[PDB]
């Protein structure tokens, strides 16, 4: 077999959020998300879909230093307008097993 390498030039605006599920040791899922998405939006999006309380699932948003940069004021602020980072550390504290 060979290897497919297709480069289609598009300077799209999306950050590489490293979503790590605490149930796993290393869950390498850096999904491209448009940084115009608010925390408010993603909550109700799953809320209306599943119909459940996402209270037992906390979002420990860490930086490169090792502190939680989630101040909850970011709930309504464009991530890509607040802090210049290629990808933030999303360690999901999923306490609902």
Swiss-Prot record:
Q: Which GO terms describe its molecular function?
A: alpha-tubulin binding
Alphabetic keyword roster: Chaperone, Cytoplasm
Annotated Gene Ontology cellular component terms: cytoplasm; cytosol; nucleus; phragmoplast
Q: Which GO terms describe its biological process?
A: cell division; embryo development ending in seed dormancy; post-chaperonin tubulin folding pathway; tubulin complex assembly
Traits of the deletion mutant: Embryo lethality.
Tissue expression profile of the protein: Expressed in roots, stems, leaves, flowers and siliques.
Look up keyword Cytoplasm and say if it applies: yes
Where does it live in the cell?
A: Cytoplasm
Source organism superkingdom = Eukaryota
Q: What does this protein do?
A: Involved in control of cell division. Regulates probably the availability of alpha-tubulin for dimerization of alpha-/beta-tubulin, which is required for proper microtubule biogenesis. Decreased expression of TFCB results in enlarged mesophyll cells and leaf epidermal cells with bulged nuclei, increased ploidy and increased numbers of spindles and phragmoplasts.
The record describes its quaternary structure and partners as:
Supercomplex made of cofactors A to E. Cofactors A and D function by capturing and stabilizing tubulin in a quasi-native conformation. Cofactor E binds to the cofactor D-tubulin complex; interaction with cofactor C then causes the release of tubulin polypeptides that are committed to the native state. Interacts with TUBA6.
The UniProt family comment states: Belongs to the TBCB family.
Q: What is this protein called?
A: Tubulin-folding cofactor B
> Whose protein is this, by species?
Arabidopsis thaliana
The organism's lineage? Answer: Eukaryota, Viridiplantae, Streptophyta, Embryophyta, Tracheophyta
* First and last residues shown, out of full length: 10 to 96 of 243
